[PDB]
Amino acid sequence: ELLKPRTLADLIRILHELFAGDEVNVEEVQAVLEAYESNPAEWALYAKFDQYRYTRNLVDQGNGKFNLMILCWGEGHGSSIHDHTDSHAFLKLLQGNLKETLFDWPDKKSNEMIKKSERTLRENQCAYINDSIGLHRVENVSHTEPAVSLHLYSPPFDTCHAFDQRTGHKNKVTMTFHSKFGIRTP
Ligand SMILES: [Cl-]
Ligand SMILES: [Fe+3]
Incomplete structure (x- = not known):
């Protein structure tokens, strides 16, 4: 039963439930991610920028099931064209x-x-x-x-x-x- 995440911490708790098993309900995961309303105070800790390129800031290791991270993109920063190593992204x-x-x-x-x-x-x-x-x-x-x-x-x-x-x-x-x-x- 999918409920609205009240905070980033709550989102993380919900994600641990959705990834408790061996498969992934992509539509449910996307729906809960979408339902979290970004609150800058909750993630300020992780929002560490670099002047020259985007940064990857690990937030949670998902009890081994997933990596949750925050990426910080300066003006004009971007990624390569890339794949996702047989993972959901x-x-x-x-x-x-x-x-x-x-x-x-x-x-x-x-x-x-x-x-x-x-x-x-x-x-x-x-x-x-x-x-x-x-x-x-x-x-x-x-x-x-x-x-x-x-x-x-x-x-x-x-x-x-x-x-x-x-x-x-x-x-x-x-x-x-x-x-x-x-x-x-x-
Ligand atoms: Cl990506
Ligand atoms: Fe990607």
Whole structure:
């Protein structure tokens, strides 16, 4: 029985219930993420920015079932085109707007990766992706507003692939945390 998360802490408690088992009801998870109304005071601890690129700030380890993290995007900061390592990936905006561009998996032949679509994700909206859907790039294209998003990945993963838009060629990337549980982790 899905109830509205009253706070980020409450959201986390609900997520632990939704991930108690071995499978994932994606629509329920997305619905509860969407229902949490971003409250900046509740996540200020995790919202640690870097001047040069977006940061990943671990919030909860989901009793091993998922990683929940907050990503902080300076003006003009964005990601690679990337996959999600056979995991579910949820993205909820907590502040600002992000542009999500979708791409299909490349063929073996070297070719320009053509965007299949794009959307603007707005405050409190939740998006979902997995490798069966395709690849994406996420970007804060704003010149004036930093963005903050809440990401849930299940199972957790710390490696993924970045794709070269010019060729479709992929490279393995290890993902790093800027902080964990509010503590900067050089
Ligand atoms: Cl993502
Ligand atoms: Fe992603």
